[PDB]
């Protein structure tokens, strides 16, 4: 329905065809299909806010051409 | 026993030494506590202020309690976690409290961390331009292409990139899939600039060990919409010590602002001169503590 951009780990930009009702789990599944990163290892940041699992893109007001940033978790303790 | 939560410690230290943060917390604490005299988001402000007080009294002559506030606001934070991820929680719930309190110095996070980005897209057939405005709290840059300077890393983030092939841009003017050039430019510049180095990689997830040539003074003008006249300077570096992304130990190094770098290893403090600290950040030294978060303050 609409196309959004994702900046991968190397700065390269990819595109996703998503619906306004799509959940964050669905978006992370699509990113895996293009990048090969498991959904549980993915963190998506839009407009400085992290996308939480279970919410929809309409909740965060992600429209066409909106850019998500894909980062991993660097655990430390 | 303190260093068991070095993801929350190291972030708390940069925030403590962040220009105008503690004053922002105490201003909101007064309003918060006076209203209490006259809810879990209220706890974060109260918990943060107590921690700010605790460091003050010791320095003049708690990280656990902050974590119990986080265990309610965030279910995971009750293990080893990501330092930058905790930064979002503290800096996000403070603004959430502010957005509620303002409705009832209220721009604590917005004036200090948030900025504005202009995302311009240029179709290569019709040569039309479309723009987007997005907020940002940190500039997530790559570390390896797939010695390199931070100028190269930000350029990979903000310079004109050409999306081609499988990632073709859908132009509404042409009504067809098209090649496009994307160039994100900074419009509004906050007082604290965080640069999140994506030192992780993928092939099979690994941690890139070679750092970039981090500069002491950085100018974000070439990727700014306006001809700026302002530069930025390092005042804090959070590092990650380890060989895998699934475990490690975070450290912090904040500049004294007298003119040195405190090294924060669990519960120790070791002052380091300006030249030696910059030497230890060079890639040729093979730093065991790979830089993760870089913070710059406006001069
Ligand atoms: C700023 O530390 C923190 N901030 C926020 N959260 C935290 C932890 C979550 C609790 C800390 C934190 N973490 C670890 C330790 C270990 N000891 N201490 C207290 C301390 C720290 C720095 C100093 C100190 N300051 C200076 C000067 F800069 F003023 F010159 C020189 N010295 C030295 C040279 C005497 C004096 C006392 C820590 N504090
Ligand atoms: Zn076009």
Residue numbers in the entry:
A (entry chain C): 0 to 76
B (entry chain D): 85 to 122, 140 to 162, 177 to 193, 196 to 221, 422 to 463, 482 to 538, 548 to 601, 744 to 785
Sentences from the paper on this structure:
Monoubiquitination of PCNA recruits polymerases that can bypass sites of DNA damage, while monoubiquitination of FANCI-FANCD2 appears to lock the complex onto chromatin. Ubiquitin-specific protease 1 (USP1) is one such target, with small-molecule inhibitors already in clinical trials. We find that KSQ-4279 binds to the same cryptic site of USP1 as ML323 but disrupts the protein structure in subtly different ways.
KSQ-4279 binds the same cryptic pocket as ML323, between the palm and thumb subdomains, displacing several residues of the hydrophobic core. We refer to these residues, 76–88 of USP1, as the replaced by inhibitor region (RIR). The 4-cyclopropyl-6-methoxypyrimidin-5-yl group of KSQ-4279 occupies the same position as the 2-propan-2-ylphenyl group in ML323. N160 of USP1 is within the hydrogen bonding distance of KSQ-4279, similar to the ML323 structure. The β-turn on which the catalytic aspartates, D751 and D752,34 reside is pushed by the pyrazolo[3,4-d]pyrimidine group of KSQ-4279, slightly displacing these residues with respect to the inhibitor-free USP1. F101 is pushed out slightly to accommodate the methoxyl substituent of KSQ-4279, which was not observed for ML323-bound USP1. However, unlike the ML323 structure, helix α4 in this region remains in the same position as in the inhibitor-free structure, and the region between α3 and α4 is poorly resolved and was left unmodelled. The β-turn on which D751 and D752 reside is displaced; however, the density for the carboxyl groups of D751 and D752 was not sufficient to unambiguously assign these atoms in the KSQ-4279-bound structure.
